[PDB]
Ligand binder design. Structure first.
Ligand SMILES: O=[N+]([O-])c1ccc2[nH]ccc2c1
Ligand SMILES: [Ca+2]
Lengths: 364, 361
């Protein structure tokens, strides 16, 4: 195995395939698989749950073969070499020699044949969409995912195909985000759970260009192709809860207000909320919202804002972090809060589009 | 106590005074007197006093409030906001637009004041010079060493120069700058936390700093801020005895090439104690590293060197720290032998000097 590649054709690929890898439980898991074959260097990183594969074309002399070497050491070497460096690599038994200028690096190898390999699987649904759509879908809901919950499925993100739409759902038990976006193709109905780390990789591989995303989904896997990267993840086995089941029945009490005015008042109020419980109270009345927080020292914050509202007056408490998370993920001009009563969750949406909705439970 | 003041005029004062365990140490002392608002923060070891002018109706008085909360509130208000503040028994009410806040207070009397003391040594210098002096040597301070007197920086006055020296027993940094004033010869040790805070009040503009040094205290005045720190009470080593007495072997090298070769080679050094071996020979330097994996790095660099060949190891971070402090075209390394420390300087300046012990590999 031999190749010589210019630094910058190696770097971005090396970073992408390092993404699944911290502290490797076993040595081979900290390695990348390098393969030269029919004119192409493939780089593969895995954590056993997912794989990221990069392909780099080789325009300079090369010879086939395969080995594995430490991912971070090799990345840091290529990164630290000077701009435009030629990186000449050759497998030499138990070492892989890397040379560039008068820099020389000897990396210890482990057999390519020992590198872990995701099992072959079959595609069942396929579609293409813009990267901006996939980014939109993920950033809309990602924050609502659970973090290291014993209920393993909540640590992921639900991906769901219905009619002409791709949808994401995330929840942690206390709050929910769902976001549907259309993609100009009719589709079958699959409902799959992507693991937290896969959602991060998916996001990581969107460059913000005009290469579209090809998605493939099987019973137990998901694959995304962007440009010269192929990301494949095992799917999480479980039942994600049902979003239709938890949206509010009849929240015909509608408050409309500026997203940023609301965010900043909630932000200011939160400063004097309970440090642990983060509760604030909202008083709604004709065209007016009042937000108050207090903490056990009897410090108090009050914010008054003009809003659009015709309903009966009411009063309700929310965890201000959850509201702020929602308003931060909204990044729109106006928000719609759809209330029922002081003991019922609120549904929050961009006032100008129902493509996303958020459910937050009330607190006493 | 009541004042109404532009959010605009409180931001930078609050940022400065929220820099310096006990509960009232997390509070700010606010004082209105003679048409001025004074804000003070402290950690008992140092303090920062900021002053704001008050043109709008105001009432004299004083109290203390949670520093981070008062800061986050004022900062959280919208740009252009007016902030009306009034003391009201055991609470301070803050108001702006239709936002209202009541913060808990502690009595202004209970707020600690650093004991009064007397100035013995005084001088003015540009902010820029003080920043250069601190930047040159800051990284060589000890962090949490039993030898308390290394956990900080020597400020020395000699001739018409201010000098800083810092060291952790393994590497040492010295920098001197002329301030155009005849000074008595005098040495004090500023605690590192004090050095860090002094640096953060230096915005890098045109503005002289005024320094006042007491037997146990240092004070700096710039603009509308007054920073005061206690000194550290011990015996700082003498940089003159640390400089190698005749480092006869002199090598010059490109700063950045040296740095990148050090940084790259270190990738394959020991993760816990990162060191590289240097083999100096006729106009050539080779840097090598090894690790328990039996992995090896080698960099060869063109350098300027004639004189006896030798192999000597160095700690990577000590050298990198020096080369980053230097940020110049070429560095000179003045070597003695394989067992002795080395002196490093900017090849085109003696303003600063670094001494680094060798590492056995
Ligand atoms: O680098 N040195 O050789 C060095 C640094 C600090 C020191 N303090 C006392 C001796 C000494 C030496
Ligand atoms: Ca109010």
């Amino acid at each position: 195995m031999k190749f010589t590649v210019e630094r910058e054709h190696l770097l971005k690929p090396l970073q992408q395939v390092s993404g699944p890898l911290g502290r490797p439980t076993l040595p081979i898991l900290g390695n990348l698989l390098l393969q030269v074959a029919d004119g192409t260097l493939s780089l593969t990183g895995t954590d056993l749950e997912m794989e990221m594969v990069a392909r780099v074309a080789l325009v300079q002399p090369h010879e086939p073969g395969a080995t594995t070497v430490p991912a971070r050491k090799f990345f840091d070497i290529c990164r630290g070499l000077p701009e435009g460096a030629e990186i000449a690599v050759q497998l030499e038994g138990e070492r892989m020699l890397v040379r560039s200028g008068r820099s020389r690096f000897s990396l210890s190898t482990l057999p390519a044949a020992d590198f872990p390999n995701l099992d072959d699987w079959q595609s069942e649904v396929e579609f293409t969409l813009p990267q901006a759509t996939m980014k939109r879908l993920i950033e809309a809901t990602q924050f609502s995912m659970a973090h290291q919950d014993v209920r393993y499925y909540l640590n992921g993100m639900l991906f769901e195909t219905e009619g002409e739409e791709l949808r994401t759902v995330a929840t942690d038990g206390h709050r929910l985000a769902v976001c549907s976006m259309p993609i100009g193709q009719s589709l079958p109905s699959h409902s799959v759970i992507v693991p937290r780390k896969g959602v991060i990789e998916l996001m990581r591989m969107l460059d913000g260009g005009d290469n579209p995303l090809r998605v493939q989904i099987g019973s137990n896997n998901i694959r995304a192709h962007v440009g010269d990267f192929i990301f494949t993840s095992k799917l999480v086995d479980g039942r994600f809860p049902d979003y239709r089941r938890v949206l509010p029945k009849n929240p015909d009490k509608h408050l409309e207000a500026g997203c940023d005015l609301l965010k900043q008042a909630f932000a200011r109020a939160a400063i004097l909320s309970n440090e642990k419980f983060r509760g604030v109270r909202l008083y709604v009345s004709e065209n007016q919202l009042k937000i108050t927080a207090n903490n056990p020292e009897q410090e108090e914050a009050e914010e008054i804002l003009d809003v659009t509202y015709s309903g009966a007056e009411m009063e309700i408490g929310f965890n201000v972090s959850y509201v702020l998370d929602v308003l931060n993920a909204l990044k729109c001009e106006n928000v719609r809060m759809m209330l029922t009563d002081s003991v019922s969750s609120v549904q929050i949406e961009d006032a100008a589009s129902q493509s996303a909705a958020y459910v937050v439970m009330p607190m006493r």
